[PDB]
Amino acid sequence: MFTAKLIKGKTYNVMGITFRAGVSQTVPKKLYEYLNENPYFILTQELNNQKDDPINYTESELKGMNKAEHESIISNLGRNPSDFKNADERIAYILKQIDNKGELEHHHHHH
């Protein structure tokens, strides 16, 4: 997660985002580096998602995902992606786990 807080200003409108001095607001990577150039803000990025289940992603993202990326993914799963050499193999196998994420709130009082 990226966040910026106005240190130079008091109330400033960046593109379509409204920042105020003292007010931290979460921004995308685009705006983070955009405001990295613009010395009006203090920039801070922290990872709330330290570890998730790293073996299930968008096939669209995996279509543009590099060789070592696919490998490190399935390595975190605990499988050897060295046998799977073609993109088809690697993408399909990862898609099996995006299929394994069927439910999150299977708990009552939240249905």
UniProtKB/Swiss-Prot annotation:
Disulfide bonds: none
Superkingdom of origin: Bacteria
SUPFAM superfamilies reported for this sequence: PriA/YqbF domain, Rho N-terminal domain-like
Coiled-coil region: none
Name the record gives this protein: Uncharacterized protein YqbF
Organism: Bacillus subtilis (strain 168)
Organism classification: Bacteria, Bacillati, Bacillota, Bacilli, Bacillales
Gene: yqbF
